[PDB]
Design an enzyme around this catalytic site. Structure first.
Site, short mmCIF file in Angstrom:
data_model
loop_
_atom_site.label_atom_id
_atom_site.label_comp_id
_atom_site.label_asym_id
_atom_site.label_seq_id
_atom_site.Cartn_x
_atom_site.Cartn_y
_atom_site.Cartn_z
CD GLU A 1 -3.54 -1.10 1.77
OE1 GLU A 1 -3.71 0.30 2.88
OE2 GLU A 1 -3.94 -1.59 1.26
CG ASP A 2 0.05 4.82 -1.37
OD1 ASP A 2 -0.32 4.25 -1.87
OD2 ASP A 2 -0.84 5.38 -0.52
CB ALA A 3 5.54 0.44 0.96
N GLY B 1 4.89 7.80 -0.66
CA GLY B 1 4.80 7.23 -0.17
C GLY B 1 6.12 6.21 0.92
NE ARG C 1 -3.95 6.38 -5.32
CZ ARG C 1 -2.07 6.12 -3.97
NH1 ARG C 1 -1.24 6.67 -4.33
NH2 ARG C 1 -2.29 5.79 -2.52
#
Ligand SMILES: Nc1ncnc2c1ncn2[C@@H]1O[C@H](COP(=O)(O)OP(=O)(O)OP(=O)(O)O)C[C@H]1O
Ligand SMILES: [Zn+2]
Ligand SMILES: [Zn+2]
Ligand SMILES: [Zn+2]
Lengths: 50, 46, 65, 1105, 50, 34
Positions: D735-737, D878, D910
């Site tokens: 997740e966004d990492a 991130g 997105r």
RNA sequence: CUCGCUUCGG
């Protein structure tokens, strides 16, 4: 003007032409270093007007 | 004991003792930095 | 502030190719052919030299001196 | 046959920015205030005299502000640079001097230069030393040439006065009430009084409500009081449409029910409905009718002027208001407040003008009061003002108002807060975008709806994407790149031209003409300028005259056909935007004109004068037809858009291909990039701030918008280009990492510097004793300083170049305890820090009060690690989830291993296609040695970069054959490789990491403190308690909320039920029934507070069995 | 390494020790050590003409 | 003086934001909390 | 330290 840590980081990235096979790994600790497992480089530059 | 400072525009070594109004000879500028220490400092290339 | 010694991704020595690069810009060379003449084949070193800003002299203009 | 296109048209934008634009708003407003407005204020208050002892006076002749100076030198000034004021924590001000003539002993004495105050000087203003200076001279003054300026320096901190937004005054507003009744309101505000008068229809008839009347009164009674007594004339003024009479009939019937038929009767009724202002001192003959007439002439509808008690114009105005209410009571054409044609912007100049007027009035009042107290009783030693003109009044008022940011004007009853804010020096973009902010009159204090929304009126004026993400979303806005705020005009030639253009006087005709279908009312700043027929000719002639130059180019004229009103606006604060004039489907601007502009023959002002480009106001652009591009131009087009990408603001200009992204991503990127880490300016090394973030090796972006070039962002970059490969790797980027390369970080990628400030003061007290610094306390055992005092120099101040550890003294400060031998107690300035820091510089200065100011600039070198926040200039914030070795990274055939691996899964939700296009364009540009442009609504197309990629031997879509670093086998799917401009954010795990032992507690309630800076503990909020209750974990809830936070043992008397102490009850004077009891300390505090409130809680204890 | 102005001075000593690139990237001997599989483009049918 | 070993080596040493007057010989925490 | 105010983060 270049900060001390930035200067040290830049100096570390400079390759050295010394053959690694002729040296040994420095032991844990032993920050003084001996003839076998270290090299010393002197950098002394004083800028002045021409 | 000579305490030495460097002014912000002259960049000249000024020796001032305690309780002196901060100034500089051959100027009037009043920002007076301290010189770098003489003690050895060890840095890590990491 | 100053040109990095090593390329970030590959690691090729790029610090020594900065001032000579400026010479090629002091000459008539374009950016691309100057980078080609410097020997930067892969685009990471080309990004290293092309996108670098030389802030060291602008900062030195504010140095004590 | 496509219409010809002027390609160089965009070159008009830089020329405009040569004279106006980003920062020139505040600077121009401040220059106008200090060069014109202050003289006007002084002329308004030039003569001051006291009632006692006439023929005595104090007359101001001329006022000067001079150049910035410092009062450090003993009764001597000295020119001071702004950076010196920054370092010494003093204010950057200039001496307010004035030349006066007055009378000491009936002999006139004049002073030609008498200081009275100090003006904080806006940087880069007319009087600022930095103006008109070269970059070399800027370096000599230790100021960055790219610094926007426009901000004040007070007590060493940089304060910016935000542009205020407020509803325009003296305008009729038709609005629905809480009960749905469609009423009217007008806030008539003159230079002296602001009064909002209302009109209501609560019972099918119209009442007028004002703060000075006990009860709202019928409108017909007011009409009769204002001179017009015949009911037929009133009905004619209201309107001759049948439904208008049907609606207005009940008001006439209500008026006829009372016996009010003359002006005297209505005046008597109003005077009865009048309320005395708390027994106003002095009584001019039981005033009533006179009070009513004075309220009608002055207090009610102040902006509408009565020449000499002739209420004809006011009658027409209130009749127009009644007619608008009646018409709006049918079709629900209720005006909306969020329309920015009704909004006005107050810059720093107007606010400073109001503040200086208030302060000067207070100063003159104080002088007059001192004169009254001194002159009539003292001696033959005649009183003269010069011995009493205190100079700290104006200076202290200005400094406090600018610093604290709260403005209290009793003369205007204005209580504003948060006017000024600390300039954010996170990055160059941070300061530049904060310099163009606009605050709203309503605050995030509540969940409002409408202002928070993005109204279409913001087109070209305000940035749509740039808004703070959070509670203040939509209430703080940013100006567009190409916008201008108008100032006030003289208003004379407008009236002259309107009178000469056939506008009939309102007094010459009855109100019936207002109801005619072809008759149009013409207003001027809320005042009825008159009536006109064939308004098209009037509007065209007015616009032609404005283009010719006989009328100021910022005077706006608009037409409202629904209300049949021609509005002429000339007040300041209105937003304007330049547009290319289009006449008969061909723009006035040609290729030759742009060629001349490029060659330097003409500038933007030449375009203005030659009727090629004209400013459009929001109200005026409501009536115009604007074409975005040349090919959009049709027959009915009156203006042409100069450049569409000027719609976005300054921060939003950083986004490459912003039109390919979703708007929330653009907003997040604006917010993120306000917080981007990078260089501040060319003097960032000499500058000492409380917190500074620098990047070791910043790089200019590969895909740069034209906005970046305009604001010279590439000179001060705030990010680095990393070879990003878009793929899923190791499952550490869920997740966004994102995954970082260990070799890249080892080679300086993301290397950052954090500078913190540690300042100390050594002040001399009232008693002639001063703070002094001891030398390091040497250990006699080793003849070396103790570990705490290890870093100190011989003078007790830490020397630059050494490293500081936790709980080490930087300044060995010792201070006296007396205010006979002085007694010194130690208050050393210790360094609180989790990690080691290096002292880069130590600055020692002396103020005029003999206070020694010491500032240490501590430096830390930080390398990116797990938890460091990273952004990608597209709102894809991130966290570095994993740092893999270089060999584990996948590699292409050329041997390139990516620095950042970002998860593909972030794209589909997105829809940030702009990031993909930016990656492709950057790859092509670095391959061919070019800088591609990601300009909004334009930029390099995909086809060109694809052709460049195929020409260079790479895949035409960036996807490249990749071999897995781990298994050594090729990947089944091609990987998307390319350089992306990633920027590091100030949010670091090292600063945010927090852990709390028992630690300190608060004195009032013995619970752990609040913040990390105070070593506070985390808080179990109400919802955490609710979740624990829902789990049913009683023991853990008890342990968390009682044992681990505020456990205490009190002594309760089992007889009286009150709290005892030390096993003894003072109330019962006994100790037999006192028993110990465990309790939260907050509960004991509550019990004691209740006892103090006479709410006695008596505890009936019992055994636990 | 760095850039100076008159008055400024750089005096330092450098201790170099043996190390492997796994510990830190400054120890890596190769700028780029990579391998690629040898391509073999084949024509299914004879292509002639333009 | 230290209440345990009777020494006078009372040092004011704050350990992680906890002010603490402690004996420097036997480590006895004389006083803590501010 | 207390209090308020702003700016952030989420
Ligand atoms: N005021 C708030 N109250 C509670 N949680 C908040 C608040 N602000 C942020 N958060 C936290 O952040 C999360 C909000 O993220 P969310 O709104 O789902 O994505 P987003 O911010 O729209 O990102 P995109 O714009 O979709 O990329 C959820 C919540 O735990
Ligand atoms: Zn000097
Ligand atoms: Zn490279
Ligand atoms: Zn009792």
């Amino acid at each position: 003007i270049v900060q001390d840590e930035i200067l040290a980081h830049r100096l570390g990235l400079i390759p050295i032409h010394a053959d690694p096979r002729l040296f040994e790994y420095r032991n844990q600790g032993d920050e003084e270093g001996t003839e076998i497992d270290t090299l010393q480089f002197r950098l002394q530059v004083r800028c002045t007007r021409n | 004991q000579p305490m030495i400072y460097i002014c912000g525009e002259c960049h000249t070594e000024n020796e001032i003792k305690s309780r002196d109004p901060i100034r500089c000879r051959e100027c009037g500028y009043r920002i007076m930095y301290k010189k770098r220490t003489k003690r050895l400092v060890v840095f890590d290339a990491r | 502030m100053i040109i990095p010694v090593r390329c970030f991704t590959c690691g090729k020595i790029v610090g020594n190719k900065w001032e000579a690069y400026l010479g090629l810009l002091q000459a008539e060379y374009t950016e691309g052919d100057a980078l080609d003449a410097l020997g930067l084949k892969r685009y990471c070193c080309r990004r290293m030299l092309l996108a670098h800003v030389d802030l060291i002299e602008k900062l030195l203009n504010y140095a004590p001196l | 046959a496509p219409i010809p296109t002027v390609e160089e048209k965009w070159r008009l934008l830089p020329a405009f920015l040569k004279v106006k634009g980003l920062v020139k708003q505040h600077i121009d407003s401040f220059n106008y205030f200090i060069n014109v407005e202050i003289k006007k204020i002084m002329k308004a208050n030039e003569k001051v005299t006291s009632d006692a002892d006439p023929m005595w006076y104090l007359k101001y002749l001329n006022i000067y502000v001079g150049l910035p100076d410092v009062e450090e030198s003993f009764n001597v000034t000295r020119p001071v640079s702004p950076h010196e004021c920054r370092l010494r924590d003093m204010t950057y001000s200039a001496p307010i001097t004035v030349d006066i003539e007055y009378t000491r002993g009936s002999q006139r004495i004049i002073r030609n230069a008498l200081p009275i105050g100090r003006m904080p000087i806006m940087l880069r203003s007319s009087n600022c030393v930095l103006t008109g200076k070269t970059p070399a001279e800027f370096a000599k003054l230790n100021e960055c040439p790219l610094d926007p300026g426009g901000y004040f320096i007070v007590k060493g901190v940089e304060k910016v006065i935000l542009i205020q937004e407020q509803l325009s005054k003296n305008r009729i507003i038709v609005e629905a009430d809480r009960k749905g009744a469609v009423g009217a309101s007008v806030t008539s505000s003159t230079h002296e009084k602001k009064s909002r008068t209302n009109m209501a229809v609560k019972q099918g008839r119209f009442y007028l409500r004002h703060n000075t009347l006990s009860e709202d009164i019928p409108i017909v009674i007011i009409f009769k009081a204002m001179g017009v007594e015949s009911d037929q004339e009133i009905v004619q003024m209201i309107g001759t449409e049948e439904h208008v009479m049907a609606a207005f009939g009940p008001s006439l019937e209500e008026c006829q029910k009372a016996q009010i038929f003359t002006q005297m009767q209505a005046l008597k009724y109003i005077g009865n409905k009048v309320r005395r202002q708390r027994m106003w001192g002095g009584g001019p003959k039981k005033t009533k009718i006179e009070e009513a007439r004075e309220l009608l002439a002055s207090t009610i509808l102040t902006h509408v002027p009565v020449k000499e008690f002739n209420f004809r114009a006011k009658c027409i105005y209130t009749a127009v208001m009644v007619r608008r209410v009646i018409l709006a009571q049918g079709d629900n054409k209720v005006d909306d407040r969020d329309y920015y044609g009704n909004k006005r912007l107050e810059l720093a100049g107007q606010l400073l003008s109001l503040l200086f007027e208030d302060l000067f009035k207070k100063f003159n009042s104080e002088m007059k009061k001192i004169a009254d107290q001194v002159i009539p009783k003292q001696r033959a030693a005649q009183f003269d003002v010069v011995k009493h003109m205190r100079q700290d009044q104006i200076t202290n008022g200005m400094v406090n108002a600018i610093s604290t940011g709260n403005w209290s004007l009793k003369r205007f009853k204005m209580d504003r807060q948060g006017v000024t804010q600390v300039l954010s020096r996170l990055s160059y973009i941070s300061a530049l975008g904060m310099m163009t902010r606009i605050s709203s009159q309503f605050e995030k204090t509540r969940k409002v709806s409408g202002p928070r929304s993005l109204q279409p009126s913001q087109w070209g004026m305000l940035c749509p994407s740039d808004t703070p993400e959070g509670e203040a979303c939509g209430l703080v806005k940013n100006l567009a790149l190409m916008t201008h705020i108008t100032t006030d005009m003289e208003d004379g030639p407008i009236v002259k031209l309107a009178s000469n253009l056939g506008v009939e006087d309102v007094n010459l005709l009855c109100g019936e003409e207002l109801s005619y279908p072809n008759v149009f009312l013409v207003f001027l700043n809320g005042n009825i300028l008159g009536v006109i027929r064939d308004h098209k000719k009037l509007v065209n002639t007015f616009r032609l005259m404005r283009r010719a130059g006989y009328i100021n180019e910022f005077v706006s004229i608009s037409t409202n056909l629904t209300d049949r009103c021609v509005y002429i606006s000339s007040d300041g604060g209105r937003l304007c935007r330049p547009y290319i004039i289009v006449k008969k489907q061909k723009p006035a601007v040609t290729n030759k004109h742009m060629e001349e502009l490029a060659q330097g023959y003409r500038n933007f002002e030449d375009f203005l004068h030659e009727s090629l480009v004209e400013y459009l106001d929001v109200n005026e652009e409501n009536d115009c037809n604007i074409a975005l591009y040349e090919h959009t131009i049709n027959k009915d087009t009156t203006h042409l858009e100069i450049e569409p990408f000027t719609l976005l603001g300054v921060c939003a200009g950083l986004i490459p291909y912003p039109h390919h992204n979703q708007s929330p991503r653009n907003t997040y990127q604006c917010a993120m990039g306000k917080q981007a880490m990078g260089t501040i300016g060319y003097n960032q090394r000499n500058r000492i701030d409380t917190l500074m973030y620098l990047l070791a090796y910043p790089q200019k972006p590969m895909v740069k918008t034209k906005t970046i070039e305009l604001i010279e962002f590439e000179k001060l970059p705030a990010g680095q280009n990393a070879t990003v490969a878009v793929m899923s790797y190791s499952g550490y980027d869920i997740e966004d990492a994102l995954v970082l390369n260990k070799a890249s970080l080892d080679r300086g990628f993301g290397r950052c510097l954090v500078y913190k400030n540690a300042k100390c003061t050594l002040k001399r007290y009232t008693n002639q004793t001063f703070d002094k610094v001891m030398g390091p306390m040497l250990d006699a055992a080793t003849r070396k300083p103790i570990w705490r005092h290890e870093i100190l120099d011989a003078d007790g101040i830490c020397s630059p170049g050494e490293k500081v550890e936790n709980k080490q003294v930087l300044v060995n400060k010792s201070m006296p305890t007396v205010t006979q031998q002085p007694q010194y107690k130690d208050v050393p300035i210790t360094y609180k820090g989790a990690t080691d820091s290096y002292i880069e510089k130590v600055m020692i200065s002396s103020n005029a009060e003999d206070a020694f100011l010491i500032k240490m600039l501590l430096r830390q070198t930080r390398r990116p690690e797990i938890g460091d926040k990273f952004s990608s200039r597209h709102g894809q914030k991130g966290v570095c989830g994993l740092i893999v070795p270089q060999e584990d990274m996948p590699f292409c055939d050329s041997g390139i291993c990516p620095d950042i691996i970002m998860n593909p899964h972030g794209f589909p939700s997105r829809m940030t296609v702009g990031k993909l296009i930016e990656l492709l364009a950057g790859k092509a540009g670095v391959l061919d040695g070019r800088f591609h442009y990601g300009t909004a609504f334009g930029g390099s197309k995909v086809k060109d970069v694809c052709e460049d990629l195929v020409r260079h031997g790479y895949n035409y879509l960036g996807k490249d054959y990749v071999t897995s670093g781990i298994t050594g086998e090729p990947l089944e799917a091609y990987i998307y490789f390319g350089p992306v401009y990633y920027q590091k954010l100030k949010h670091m795990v090292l600063d945010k990491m927090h852990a709390r032992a028992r630690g300190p507690r608060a004195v009032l309630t013995r619970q752990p403190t609040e913040g990390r800076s105070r070593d506070g503990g985390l808080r179990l909020g109400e919802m955490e308690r609710d979740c624990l209750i829902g789990y049913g974990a009683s023991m853990l809830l008890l342990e968390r909320l009682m044992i681990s936070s505020d456990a205490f043992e009190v002594d309760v008397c089992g007889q009286c039920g009150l709290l005892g102490y030390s096993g003894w009850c003072h109330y019962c004077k006994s100790s037999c029934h006192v028993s110990s009891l465990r309790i939260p300390y907050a509960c004991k505090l509550l019990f004691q507070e209740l006892q103090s409130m006479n709410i006695i809680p008596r505890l009936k204890l019992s055994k636990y069995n | 390494i760095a850039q100076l102005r008159p008055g400024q001075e750089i005096d330092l000593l450098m201790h170099c020790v043996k190390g492997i690139g796994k510990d830190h990237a400054k120890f890596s001997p190769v700028a780029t050590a990579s391998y690629r599989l040898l391509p073999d483009i084949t024509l299914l049918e004879p292509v002639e003409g333009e | 003086r230290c209440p345990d070993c009777g020494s006078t080596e009372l040092v004011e040493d704050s350990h992680y934001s906890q002010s603490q007057l402690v004996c420097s010989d036997c480590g006895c925490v004389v006083t803590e909390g501010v």
